[PDB]
Write a protein that binds this ligand. Sequence first.
Ligand SMILES: Nc1ncnc2c1ncn2[C@@H]1O[C@H](COP(=O)(O)OP(=O)(O)O)[C@@H](O)[C@H]1O
Ligand SMILES: Nc1ncnc2c1ncn2[C@@H]1O[C@H](COP(=O)(O)OP(=O)(O)O)[C@@H](O)[C@H]1O
Ligand SMILES: Nc1ncnc2c1ncn2[C@@H]1O[C@H](COP(=O)(O)OP(=O)(O)O)[C@@H](O)[C@H]1O
Ligand SMILES: Nc1ncnc2c1ncn2[C@@H]1O[C@H](COP(=O)(O)OP(=O)(O)O)[C@@H](O)[C@H]1O
Ligand SMILES: Nc1ncnc2c1ncn2[C@@H]1O[C@H](COP(=O)(O)OP(=O)(O)O)[C@@H](O)[C@H]1O
Ligand SMILES: Nc1ncnc2c1ncn2[C@@H]1O[C@H](COP(=O)(O)OP(=O)(O)O)[C@@H](O)[C@H]1O
Lengths: 307, 307, 307, 307, 307, 307
Amino acid sequence: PLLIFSGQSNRPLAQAIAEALGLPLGKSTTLRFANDNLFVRYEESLREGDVFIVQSFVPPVQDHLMELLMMVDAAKGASAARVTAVIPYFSYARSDKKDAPRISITARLIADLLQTAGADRVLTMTLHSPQVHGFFKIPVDHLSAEPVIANYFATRVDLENAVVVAPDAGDLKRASALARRLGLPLAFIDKERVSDTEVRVRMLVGEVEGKTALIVDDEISTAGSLVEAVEALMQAGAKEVYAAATHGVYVGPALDRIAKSPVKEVAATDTCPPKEGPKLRTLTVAPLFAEAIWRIHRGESVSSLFT
Amino acid sequence: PLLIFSGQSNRPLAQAIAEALGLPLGKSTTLRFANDNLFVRYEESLREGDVFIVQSFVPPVQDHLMELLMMVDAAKGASAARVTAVIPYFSYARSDKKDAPRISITARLIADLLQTAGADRVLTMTLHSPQVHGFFKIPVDHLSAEPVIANYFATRVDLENAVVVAPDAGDLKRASALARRLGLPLAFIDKERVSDTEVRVRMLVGEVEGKTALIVDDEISTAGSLVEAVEALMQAGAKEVYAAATHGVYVGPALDRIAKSPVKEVAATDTCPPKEGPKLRTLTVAPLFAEAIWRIHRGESVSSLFT
Amino acid sequence: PLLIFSGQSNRPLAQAIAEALGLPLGKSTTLRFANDNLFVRYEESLREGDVFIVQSFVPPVQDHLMELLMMVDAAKGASAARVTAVIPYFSYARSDKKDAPRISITARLIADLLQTAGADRVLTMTLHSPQVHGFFKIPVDHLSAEPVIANYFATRVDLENAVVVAPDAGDLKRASALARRLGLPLAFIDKERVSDTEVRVRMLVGEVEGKTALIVDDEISTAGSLVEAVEALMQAGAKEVYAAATHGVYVGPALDRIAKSPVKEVAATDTCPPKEGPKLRTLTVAPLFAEAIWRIHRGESVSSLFT
Amino acid sequence: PLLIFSGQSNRPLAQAIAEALGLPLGKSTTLRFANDNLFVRYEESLREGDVFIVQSFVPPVQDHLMELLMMVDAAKGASAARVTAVIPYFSYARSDKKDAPRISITARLIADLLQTAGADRVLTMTLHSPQVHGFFKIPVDHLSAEPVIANYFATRVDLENAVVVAPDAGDLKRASALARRLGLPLAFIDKERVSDTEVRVRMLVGEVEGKTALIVDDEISTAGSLVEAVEALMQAGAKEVYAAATHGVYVGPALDRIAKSPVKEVAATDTCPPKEGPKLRTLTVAPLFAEAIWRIHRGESVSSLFT
Amino acid sequence: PLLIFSGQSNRPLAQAIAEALGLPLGKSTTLRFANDNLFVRYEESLREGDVFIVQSFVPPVQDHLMELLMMVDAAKGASAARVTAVIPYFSYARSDKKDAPRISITARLIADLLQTAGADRVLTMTLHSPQVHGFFKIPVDHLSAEPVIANYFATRVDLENAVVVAPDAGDLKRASALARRLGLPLAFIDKERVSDTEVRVRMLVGEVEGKTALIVDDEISTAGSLVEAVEALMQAGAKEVYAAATHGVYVGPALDRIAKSPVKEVAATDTCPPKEGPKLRTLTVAPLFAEAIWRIHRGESVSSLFT
Amino acid sequence: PLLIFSGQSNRPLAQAIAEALGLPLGKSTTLRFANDNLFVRYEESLREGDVFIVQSFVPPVQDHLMELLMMVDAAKGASAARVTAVIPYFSYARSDKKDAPRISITARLIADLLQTAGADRVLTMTLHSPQVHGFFKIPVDHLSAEPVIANYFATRVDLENAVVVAPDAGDLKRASALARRLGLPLAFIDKERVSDTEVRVRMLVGEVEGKTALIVDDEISTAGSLVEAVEALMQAGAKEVYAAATHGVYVGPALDRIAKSPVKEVAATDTCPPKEGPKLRTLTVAPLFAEAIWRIHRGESVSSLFT
Ligand SMILES: Nc1ncnc2c1ncn2[C@@H]1O[C@H](COP(=O)(O)OP(=O)(O)O)[C@@H](O)[C@H]1O
Ligand SMILES: Nc1ncnc2c1ncn2[C@@H]1O[C@H](COP(=O)(O)OP(=O)(O)O)[C@@H](O)[C@H]1O
Ligand SMILES: Nc1ncnc2c1ncn2[C@@H]1O[C@H](COP(=O)(O)OP(=O)(O)O)[C@@H](O)[C@H]1O
Ligand SMILES: Nc1ncnc2c1ncn2[C@@H]1O[C@H](COP(=O)(O)OP(=O)(O)O)[C@@H](O)[C@H]1O
Ligand SMILES: Nc1ncnc2c1ncn2[C@@H]1O[C@H](COP(=O)(O)OP(=O)(O)O)[C@@H](O)[C@H]1O
Ligand SMILES: Nc1ncnc2c1ncn2[C@@H]1O[C@H](COP(=O)(O)OP(=O)(O)O)[C@@H](O)[C@H]1O
């Protein structure tokens, strides 16, 4: 008995997911009382159901976290047989280090909050670091967006005379995996930035001058990393720059910084509800999440989607 | 080893609690990133400390809840010997029953969340129902508002042949304790629904005509319950109506509904930050919380400040 | 896979539950050694079964509690797929507040004990307060007595221009539901203390003189609360008084106090075994429990038997 | 802050324990309501206390179990720093095997019940099997009665021409340890009993005929094992028999079977409240429990009492 | 979906179990990096599978323990519906008491390690003591080797003038049962362990006279107990000595000591990989484990194997 | 009472830690029976002690892991007030992701095993990745080896024309910090692991030109990364290469490959017992661990070591 519900974060994705399998979104309501307190209710019976609750960590984030936790709790209190937290974008995966003393490793905290709310498993996509998987004791199915991102580049850009680029050192793994998949060279643009030598503006590594540059990242939030990588690419010689990421968070001055940038096109998935933009394009992962949910429900191989 | 910290919900209350036992507020910063994700940090060492974190559940409540959860988690991660969640107002205390099918008993969920975050105890004032205590496995010290509410009526009303009233059966327990510490007789109301229709066709009990009314309630949110009773009292007789509660929540139409109603004065503690109104007196409970905290730190009887 | 078992507390109720869904009572024996230690044993395999264990908290309650705990533990040790504690009467539901310092909130303790013993869910009828639900992490299905109590008043009283009364504010919720399903108006009492002095100087509300009284309460233990209201009703007017409750506990001076009081008839379910009296009618709820159990086993809406 | 409390099982022992250290029994009350439900309350503050609660598993056993669990729970709810279950006799240590299918390993169940009630440790004496220690995750200090039993035999009996006897095979370890300590031979009397051969009455092993026999066991409940070992000893030649055990449970027909037996004297500790008997003698372990409690409180070596 | 896998400890047993169920042995890899760290990987999906993992605690024991824990952990992380640790020989069942202060009750520790790795059940054979069952909260199915040992003795030995011999008190239960099974008389040794390799016979009990002695024990490790028991039986007049044990561990000097001893034949099961010796025989428990697994998967009675 | 103990992995380090605190090394025994099972025993009382147990994960790794778990378990069973697992080298920190499907995130598993054995804290040095911290719920104090490595380089090398080199992206944070500490420039390798023994350099980034290259890494295991990095630096024109790592594991072909390489000197700490080589140097971390332990015991700031 397969049931899908949505919070308020990304109902279009959740609707599209359910639709992909020929299922409706299950009926649930969440209210906000005058004192700003949340309330959650399922209209129909969840009893003995295999239930999947879709929520992304987009603004307002803390209302969405709590709605997810409450919906998970209520589903177990309503006698669901199994409850899966479907979290297309887990923003707190960025809070995965104790990089300053006396902070919260918030990703781990949220993993434990989810577990005590009653979640039996998680379904997610492109965690900020792969180690976040280890913050959960419950099973996590961690989906890749490489297939849709690779398809976007192979179909939209022109890969004759092209290179995939890593601006950060932490980007190298994902950019290398795309380069092998697309049959393209890899290049790097200096991460320091050379705070001593003659050439103060970014130093280059690999052939870029004539070529069309391809940037892959996990997410775009303020677009600050994106915009500075593109400017460095252009002054280093490059003809044009295309960008892709899994999570188009697009927050603060992101849209305007992208518009002002000479980047040609920026592709993101619909893990986060997409925003209006002439240069913004969205690659849907609703059929991918849907096929994962179906296989989780039926005990079919999820990893064979990516192998 | 006694350290005290505040979230963003009621820093004045915590500053007063701190000054009332001769200690400074501990340095802690809580940020928001552009993506609306919280970040918490303690500036000083808390190692082997007996730490108390003050947060009331005021708007925006989900950010305050999450910040509390993070601060408790970060304090245990920073090797605090003990951490107490000082929650002056626990708003989700009202979500204590499963009165609709397939909802979250959210007060219980939050107790569990606090515990997995790492809280060793709770210090709180005037919970909506006495059964909420049993939602916590950890010890909760449950401060009473009766002393400071009685010493307001005594110190600046002074009405012989007065009467004291409850808006709710449930707060009858509170109005059968004030009432009769002052030495007056009784009255009360009991109906639904605050989340439905207008305001509100009621049922009253007691002798009020040649008598002057005092109201005792746990909290005032929308002030509908307040205005209902004031209208019902000051129409079948009744010279004048005064009002008292522990939690001055004051949201939605409340501040305006107080001015429009013939109620003389409304009394609230500073569990929630004070909101400015014409006839709106607020009673500091910072000395009471500071005394409870001093006793908790030293292992002295906290029960002794009730009797 | 549907198996049903009883302790020693109310084998008749469980026999009727079993016969009402066409299944035999499962064979289980519980012994006492000379040293007063319990011993529990299942005679048949329960392996991968959906097992339901019926025990009410009747005298001697501690032996019945322990036998329930042992039977749940032994059922999980025997590899039951699922075990439900069918608790028709949960007496410790009354220990739900910390109204005295340094006591046990015993309802919570017992929920925790049941869970560590291995109970996956609880099936119960008419808990003393609705907050007890929140003492369980596991799902509790909370059966209502209103249908069978209404269908007693309708089927064998038949009083036009009658009135319906509550002994307790708290059971006002129950008397604001019966009341008005029948179509009569209201009345209620509210005071302390059953564990103190005689019986009992009270405070009543409503119009009773030219009207005939019905009483609705959660339970009747010593029947003091019953006799108090019957005396208070049948003295300021009132033709005749009838009585109804879910739990026919009937201990101490109760059976005698019923005969001595001018109350016409007392109605109770068979959650506790029936005690023989002159005007003492008992309403079988075995068909209702059997229907709830059938629904739990098959995953059908248990909420649907409330509406 | 060292505090000792007692349940109803063995207040004289608990009083003597506290007295041994120059401390009073702390003030606690336990009531039984008319419905047979328990209630527990501490009169004084336990806050930040190192609290020890003394209870033996003697009839009525299930009331005593529950009283212990409730007292442990209430002590943690009253903010004790540490709570130790002092269980001088743990009768359910006999329920330590799954020797028939589909039973409770009740000793393990009770260990988990104790832990969820809130016990931080256990202090006990002569567990029925040493493996019961492993049923607890919390620390258990397991005291020996060999010093007091050895002292009894060395001072009361006359060890010239004496032998210590094992009737059961399971007795051999404890009887051997006493034999080495007293400088006596060991003997055995057949455990089968030879269900085939010529001599149907018990077969002998080791020299018994002229000698005075000494029986040691963990406990005496019905005295059935004791009485049959003594009769076998007399018909096998023995002059006289003395018996000792840790736990004088003395239940059912124990007292009369001992009186009818030619056993000269039967010694037991006061872990269980002793019963009246001319041939019964009690060896006090109150000073031993007291010195253990003192050392647990102070972090001094408990095992050096026995080394 | 029934799925069987193997660690490195006893692949031939796992293979024989799989083949008796009509199934392939699931594909698992275990690697050791140059730093001596282990790595496990399931080659194909085990999602929603009923997973059985076979591992005996034979040398190298800690590698085998860790591999089992990792395989259980990886099975749960890969979304197994259920995982059973099939442990034919649980060697640490000998670490079942605190018989010196400040040691680990290692059997209990391992039970808890297994549980936190994610094991839902255990299937094992001939635990050293019957209390070890109680160290596990998760269900354990405990198989007897008595039927195959009895089938073997009926095959190989003349049973006209035979007697079954327990080499110590701890084994008396198992030997007794074999006696009652085969309709033979019973005898036993009181054993005193002085070291890991050296033991001593305190006394022999029962009619040996001139019989064919059948020794049965749980395990043979160094064979010190076996060969001392053989010597004791022979110069007590026995005709000949046959030996059987469940666990043929055969370490240290065992093989040499079996060769020197006049014992005619030593049979053990293949819970542990066998070792070559002229007098050594091995009985396979693959069919019994296969049948138990078949029944556990289908929810049929496992006790029915031994009754 | 501060108490230090050692497993078998690195007794010289534990001894040096103890001696720097002015304390004896606590008496522990670890035995291996003939069946390869471990046994631990503390010789003297550690009751109410602040217990620190030193164990590195060096070969034989699984024996050392199990010994640590047993020692932690035995410490708790022997009534330690607190136990800290001091793990100078946590080798399984490399098992921190699911980079193939159906593996164990072994670092997380071990974190949970440690917690269930009863560890209250961890003290460790230079974890392979900064996310491993989040695998532990219990507090972990994570010591940097950077101060001693910097003190060493300032001692042994000419720093006028030097550059610090990270041999992979995962180590860039640590190398960067050393650069900023010593006021030197920074360079790094993009590494591609092909097997446990074999790796490849994809690209070198930064100004080497004709400098004295200082490699710093977390660990040296097979030295494949070290020697590939050395070669890459040399035929990129570097003058000379010095290397330092925290963990000198030195397994497989490491010692031979260090001898062949033109690297001048390879320094590692003594987290792992050192191995003899002409170019090998070892820096002791006993004073730093001792100071951390001293501070943990006294509740003084541990971060203050590295700021
Ligand atoms: N959940 C979050 N959302 C946004 N920013 C965060 C979050 N958690 C941590 N940060 C910030 O991000 C930085 C940590 O990431 P950083 O180490 O710079 O990059 P990477 O995560 O790629 O290694 C810190 O400066 C911290 O303040
Ligand atoms: N945390 C909350 N804040 C505001 N309103 C709530 C909250 N939880 C529940 N409610 C609403 O208020 C109702 C509970 O109030 P009610 O039944 O009148 O009991 P009480 O008289 O104790 O307030 C619920 O039915 C729900 O609609
Ligand atoms: N399980 C129980 N059985 C009988 N009496 C109880 C139990 N628990 C508590 N009590 C007693 O009854 C009182 C609770 O009743 P009361 O305060 O009148 O609330 P209610 O009106 O909800 O019954 C407690 O103060 C206590 O003395
Ligand atoms: N808690 C208990 N009190 C009294 N008898 C018990 C208890 N638990 C189990 N028994 C009974 O005792 C017997 C188990 O003990 P047994 O194996 O005969 O002796 P031993 O415990 O010395 O090995 C069983 O027949 C069982 O019915
Ligand atoms: N896992 C183990 N493997 C081998 N020997 C062990 C193990 N655990 C404990 N021992 C040793 O065996 C002794 C217990 O043996 P013993 O009491 O003779 O067994 P039993 O009496 O149950 O036959 C312990 O004191 C210890 O020396
Ligand atoms: N505990 C371990 N010890 C040694 N090697 C390991 C361990 N765990 C995993 N590995 C191997 O190391 C690989 C990861 O290495 P790599 O990603 O190069 O490390 P990093 O990128 O963090 O420097 C894994 O894919 C696996 O082959």
